[PDB]
């Protein structure tokens, strides 16, 4: 029965990124599965080693406070069977599919297995005209703490380089129907 | 009587810094008063233009955040009369603040306000990756990036306030200046 073609919630599907994730650009990411993923019961290989996982990512953030969402939409096996997870400035619609079809925002979490993270920041006068115009009379500690706290609205540019190692983890059991004409529409028993 | 030789609370004594204030080093600062300071009533010049003000400063980094304390301890007039504000480096500023508080219930007797500070602030993927393996194995990727980033503001930048910076020195209480005896004035803070 069902458990012979199911991946258990919080299975850790190890993968590495072929495509980088930049923190300005919201875009597409491709990962590659590092080993065969077996169904909870039986000997079926549901996700074969070497499968590509295609996802779409966006950066949110409340000014310094990093938010990345990755929606893993489909898996392509080395033999070329397509496994749908979620169908098709272009990411938000996919979270809505999931936010309604399941109530959960993301069906698959993305966990560290060793991320390669590059972390740059985007940027006596700017400081001085402020004091003379706006903040004359203010106390030392204040103006400077104003400048520093100020220096942290501008969100840093965070890149997760290709070659980063990751765990893709189902937030629910995922049932994989038997492929028909190279297609599997996955079911999330939530 | 008394008001003839008093500076009112929150008089703004304009001065410029002769000595810089660095945010690592806790040390000494010298400012120079930019104009005559008159007593609240009458025509007595209590702090003459060109007086040196000697202070001691420390940076109390509850880090991320910046904290600078300046205790202005004495004023030397151009004629060379010494006005005491607080007697007797990082420890020293601490005890001056504690003394001040023990007697007047206030940590600082004189505030230091901006009149145009010249502020320099200099700062401080192969590395980051090693924690992740060590002790973050199965963790969310917002969870690791936010943590790395938060850790980043943990250490504070070097902040220098360059000499030539312009400042208001402001009494937090009325200060009474007795008539100088043998080049010495021990100021009184009516608090």
């Amino acid at each position: 029965n069902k458990l012979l073609r199911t991946i258990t919630a919080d299975k850790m599907i190890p993968a590495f990124l072929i495509t980088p994730i930049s923190s300005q650009i919201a875009g597409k990411v491709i990962a590659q599965v590092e080993s065969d993923i077996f169904a909870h019961m039986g000997k079926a290989v549901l996700i074969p080693k070497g499968s590509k996982v295609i996802g779409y990512y966006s950066n949110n953030n409340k000014m310094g406070e990093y938010r990345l969402d990755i929606v893993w939409s489909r898996i392509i096996t080395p033999h070329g069977i397509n496994i749908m997870l979620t169908n098709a400035g272009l990411v938000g619609e996919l979270i809505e599919r999931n936010f309604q079809r399941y109530g959960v925002p993301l069906l698959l979490s993305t966990l560290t297995n060793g991320l390669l993270i590059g972390i740059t920041s985007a940027l006596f006068g700017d400081y001085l005209l402020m004091q003379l115009m706006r903040q004359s009379g203010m106390g030392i500690n204040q103006v400077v703490n104003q400048i520093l706290r100020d220096k942290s609205k501008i969100a840093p540019i965070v890149v997760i380089r290709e070659g980063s190692r990751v765990f893709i983890s189902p937030n629910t059991d995922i049932f994989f129907p038997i492929p028909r004409e190279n297609e599997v529409i996955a079911e999330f028993l939530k």
Side-chain angles (χ1 to χ4, degrees), chain A residues 114-120 122 125 128-148:
Chain A
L115 302 170
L116 270 77
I117 304 155
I119 206 150
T120 321
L128 187 74
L129 252 188
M130 263 315 95
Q131 299 170 56
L132 264 46
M133 243 146 43
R134 301 274 85 69
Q135 60 216 250
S136 160
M138 198 169 150
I140 301 198
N141 281 290
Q142 232 205 310
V143 327
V144 307
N145 279 300
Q146 263 299 78
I147 296 173
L148 286 174

Short mmCIF file of all heavy atoms in Angstrom, two decimals, chain A residues 114-148, unseen atoms left out:
data_model
loop_
_atom_site.label_atom_id
_atom_site.label_comp_id
_atom_site.label_asym_id
_atom_site.label_seq_id
_atom_site.Cartn_x
_atom_site.Cartn_y
_atom_site.Cartn_z
N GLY A 114 26.28 22.80 4.89
CA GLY A 114 27.50 23.51 4.54
C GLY A 114 27.27 24.47 3.40
O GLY A 114 27.54 24.15 2.24
N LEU A 115 26.76 25.65 3.72
CA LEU A 115 26.57 26.71 2.73
C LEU A 115 27.84 27.53 2.56
O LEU A 115 28.50 27.89 3.55
CB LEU A 115 25.43 27.64 3.15
CG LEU A 115 24.03 27.09 3.38
CD1 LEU A 115 23.16 28.14 4.02
CD2 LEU A 115 23.43 26.61 2.08
N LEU A 116 28.17 27.85 1.32
CA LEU A 116 29.25 28.78 1.02
C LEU A 116 28.69 30.19 0.92
O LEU A 116 28.17 30.58 -0.13
CB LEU A 116 29.98 28.38 -0.26
CG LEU A 116 31.18 27.44 -0.13
CD1 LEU A 116 30.73 26.00 0.08
CD2 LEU A 116 32.03 27.56 -1.38
N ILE A 117 28.81 30.95 2.00
CA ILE A 117 28.14 32.25 2.12
C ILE A 117 29.07 33.45 2.01
O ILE A 117 29.93 33.65 2.87
CB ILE A 117 27.38 32.37 3.45
CG1 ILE A 117 26.39 31.21 3.62
CG2 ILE A 117 26.67 33.72 3.53
CD1 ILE A 117 26.04 30.91 5.07
N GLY A 118 28.86 34.25 0.97
CA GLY A 118 29.58 35.53 0.78
C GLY A 118 28.69 36.69 1.17
O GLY A 118 27.52 36.72 0.81
N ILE A 119 29.24 37.67 1.87
CA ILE A 119 28.40 38.52 2.73
C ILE A 119 28.69 40.04 2.71
O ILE A 119 28.83 40.66 3.77
CB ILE A 119 28.41 37.93 4.19
CG1 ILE A 119 27.14 38.29 4.96
CG2 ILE A 119 29.74 38.24 4.95
CD1 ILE A 119 26.77 37.24 5.97
N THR A 120 28.76 40.65 1.53
CA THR A 120 29.20 42.07 1.40
C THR A 120 28.14 43.11 1.80
O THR A 120 26.93 42.85 1.71
CB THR A 120 29.70 42.38 -0.03
OG1 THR A 120 30.44 41.26 -0.53
CG2 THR A 120 30.61 43.61 -0.03
N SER A 121 28.60 44.29 2.23
CA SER A 121 27.72 45.44 2.46
C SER A 121 27.66 46.35 1.23
O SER A 121 28.68 46.56 0.56
CB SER A 121 28.16 46.22 3.71
N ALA A 122 26.46 46.88 0.94
CA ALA A 122 26.19 47.67 -0.28
C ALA A 122 26.98 48.98 -0.41
O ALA A 122 27.39 49.35 -1.51
CB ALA A 122 24.69 47.94 -0.41
N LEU A 123 27.18 49.68 0.72
CA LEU A 123 27.99 50.91 0.76
C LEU A 123 29.34 50.68 1.44
O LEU A 123 30.26 51.47 1.28
CB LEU A 123 27.23 52.05 1.46
N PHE A 124 33.71 62.48 6.50
CA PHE A 124 33.32 63.56 7.41
C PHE A 124 32.58 64.70 6.68
O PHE A 124 33.15 65.76 6.41
CB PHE A 124 34.54 64.09 8.16
N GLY A 125 31.30 64.46 6.37
CA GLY A 125 30.48 65.43 5.61
C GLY A 125 28.98 65.12 5.60
O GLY A 125 28.16 65.96 6.02
N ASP A 126 28.61 63.94 5.09
CA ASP A 126 27.24 63.43 5.22
C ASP A 126 26.86 63.48 6.70
O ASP A 126 25.87 64.14 7.09
CB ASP A 126 27.12 61.99 4.67
N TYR A 127 27.70 62.83 7.52
CA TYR A 127 27.67 62.92 8.99
C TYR A 127 27.62 64.38 9.53
O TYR A 127 26.87 64.65 10.48
CB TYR A 127 28.86 62.11 9.64
N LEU A 128 28.39 65.30 8.92
CA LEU A 128 28.56 66.67 9.44
C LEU A 128 27.42 67.62 9.09
O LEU A 128 27.05 68.46 9.90
CB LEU A 128 29.90 67.29 8.97
CG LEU A 128 30.32 68.66 9.54
CD1 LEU A 128 30.78 68.52 10.98
CD2 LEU A 128 31.40 69.33 8.72
N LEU A 129 26.88 67.50 7.88
CA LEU A 129 25.75 68.35 7.49
C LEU A 129 24.51 68.01 8.29
O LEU A 129 23.71 68.90 8.60
CB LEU A 129 25.46 68.24 6.00
CG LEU A 129 25.85 69.45 5.18
CD1 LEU A 129 25.33 69.28 3.78
CD2 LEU A 129 25.28 70.71 5.79
N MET A 130 24.35 66.72 8.60
CA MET A 130 23.27 66.28 9.47
C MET A 130 23.29 67.04 10.78
O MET A 130 22.29 67.62 11.18
CB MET A 130 23.33 64.77 9.72
CG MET A 130 22.41 63.92 8.80
SD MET A 130 20.70 64.58 8.59
CE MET A 130 20.85 65.63 6.92
N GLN A 131 24.44 67.05 11.44
CA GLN A 131 24.54 67.63 12.77
C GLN A 131 24.27 69.10 12.75
O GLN A 131 23.64 69.62 13.65
CB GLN A 131 25.90 67.35 13.38
CG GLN A 131 26.20 65.89 13.53
CD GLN A 131 27.63 65.64 13.91
OE1 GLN A 131 28.12 66.15 14.90
NE2 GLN A 131 28.30 64.83 13.12
N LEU A 132 24.73 69.78 11.71
CA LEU A 132 24.65 71.23 11.65
C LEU A 132 23.26 71.71 11.32
O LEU A 132 22.82 72.72 11.83
CB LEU A 132 25.65 71.79 10.65
CG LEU A 132 26.98 72.26 11.24
CD1 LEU A 132 27.52 71.24 12.22
CD2 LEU A 132 28.00 72.54 10.16
N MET A 133 22.58 70.95 10.46
CA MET A 133 21.21 71.23 10.04
C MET A 133 20.20 70.62 11.00
O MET A 133 19.60 71.32 11.82
CB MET A 133 21.00 70.69 8.63
CG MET A 133 20.66 71.79 7.55
SD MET A 133 21.38 71.34 5.91
CE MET A 133 20.82 69.07 5.92
N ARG A 134 20.04 69.29 10.90
CA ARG A 134 19.05 68.54 11.68
C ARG A 134 19.34 68.51 13.19
O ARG A 134 18.52 68.97 13.97
CB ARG A 134 18.91 67.08 11.18
CG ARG A 134 18.49 66.86 9.71
CD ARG A 134 16.97 66.87 9.49
NE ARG A 134 16.46 68.23 9.31
CZ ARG A 134 16.70 68.99 8.24
NH1 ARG A 134 17.45 68.54 7.23
NH2 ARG A 134 16.19 70.21 8.18
N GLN A 135 20.50 67.97 13.60
CA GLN A 135 20.71 67.57 15.01
C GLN A 135 21.73 68.36 15.87
O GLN A 135 22.46 67.78 16.67
CB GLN A 135 20.95 66.05 15.11
CG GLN A 135 22.15 65.50 14.35
CD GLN A 135 21.89 64.11 13.76
OE1 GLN A 135 22.45 63.10 14.21
NE2 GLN A 135 21.03 64.05 12.74
N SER A 136 21.76 69.68 15.73
CA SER A 136 22.58 70.50 16.61
C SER A 136 22.03 70.47 18.02
O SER A 136 20.83 70.60 18.20
CB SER A 136 22.63 71.94 16.14
OG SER A 136 23.02 72.75 17.21
N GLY A 137 22.89 70.33 19.00
CA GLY A 137 22.45 70.30 20.39
C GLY A 137 22.31 68.89 20.92
O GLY A 137 22.40 68.67 22.10
N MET A 138 22.10 67.94 20.03
CA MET A 138 22.01 66.53 20.39
C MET A 138 23.31 66.09 21.10
O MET A 138 24.34 66.72 20.94
CB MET A 138 21.78 65.73 19.12
CG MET A 138 21.24 64.34 19.26
SD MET A 138 20.74 63.77 17.62
CE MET A 138 20.99 62.00 17.72
N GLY A 139 23.26 65.03 21.90
CA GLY A 139 24.40 64.63 22.71
C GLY A 139 25.25 63.64 21.97
O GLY A 139 24.73 62.87 21.17
N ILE A 140 26.56 63.62 22.23
CA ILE A 140 27.49 62.84 21.43
C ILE A 140 26.97 61.43 21.19
O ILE A 140 26.72 61.04 20.04
CB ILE A 140 28.90 62.76 22.07
CG1 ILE A 140 29.50 64.14 22.23
CG2 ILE A 140 29.85 61.95 21.19
CD1 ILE A 140 30.99 64.11 22.44
N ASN A 141 26.79 60.68 22.26
CA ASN A 141 26.42 59.29 22.12
C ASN A 141 25.28 59.14 21.13
O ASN A 141 25.24 58.17 20.37
CB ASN A 141 26.03 58.69 23.46
CG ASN A 141 27.23 58.33 24.30
OD1 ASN A 141 27.97 57.40 23.99
ND2 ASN A 141 27.42 59.07 25.39
N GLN A 142 24.38 60.11 21.14
CA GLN A 142 23.17 60.01 20.37
C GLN A 142 23.44 60.07 18.87
O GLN A 142 23.11 59.13 18.15
CB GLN A 142 22.18 61.08 20.80
CG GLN A 142 20.84 60.50 21.14
CD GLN A 142 19.71 61.49 20.98
OE1 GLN A 142 19.76 62.63 21.48
NE2 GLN A 142 18.66 61.06 20.27
N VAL A 143 24.07 61.16 18.42
CA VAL A 143 24.31 61.35 16.99
C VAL A 143 25.03 60.16 16.38
O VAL A 143 24.65 59.70 15.31
CB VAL A 143 25.08 62.67 16.64
CG1 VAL A 143 24.74 63.78 17.61
CG2 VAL A 143 26.56 62.45 16.62
N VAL A 144 26.04 59.65 17.08
CA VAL A 144 26.85 58.57 16.54
C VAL A 144 26.12 57.24 16.54
O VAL A 144 26.27 56.47 15.60
CB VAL A 144 28.25 58.41 17.24
CG1 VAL A 144 28.99 59.73 17.24
CG2 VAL A 144 28.11 57.89 18.64
N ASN A 145 25.34 56.98 17.58
CA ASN A 145 24.49 55.79 17.62
C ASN A 145 23.41 55.92 16.56
O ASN A 145 22.99 54.93 15.97
CB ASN A 145 23.87 55.56 19.00
CG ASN A 145 24.83 54.89 19.98
OD1 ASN A 145 25.31 53.77 19.75
ND2 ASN A 145 25.09 55.56 21.09
N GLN A 146 22.98 57.16 16.30
CA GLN A 146 22.10 57.43 15.19
C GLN A 146 22.73 57.05 13.85
O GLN A 146 22.07 56.48 13.00
CB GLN A 146 21.62 58.87 15.18
CG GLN A 146 20.23 59.05 15.81
CD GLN A 146 19.15 58.25 15.07
OE1 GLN A 146 19.02 57.03 15.23
NE2 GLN A 146 18.37 58.96 14.25
N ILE A 147 24.01 57.36 13.69
CA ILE A 147 24.72 57.06 12.45
C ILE A 147 24.92 55.56 12.25
O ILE A 147 24.93 55.07 11.12
CB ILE A 147 26.09 57.76 12.38
CG1 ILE A 147 25.90 59.28 12.35
CG2 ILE A 147 26.87 57.29 11.16
CD1 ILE A 147 27.20 60.07 12.44
N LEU A 148 25.07 54.84 13.36
CA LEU A 148 25.45 53.44 13.31
C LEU A 148 24.23 52.56 13.15
O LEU A 148 24.20 51.67 12.30
CB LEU A 148 26.23 53.05 14.56
CG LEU A 148 27.68 53.53 14.71
CD1 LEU A 148 28.19 53.14 16.09
CD2 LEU A 148 28.60 52.96 13.63
#
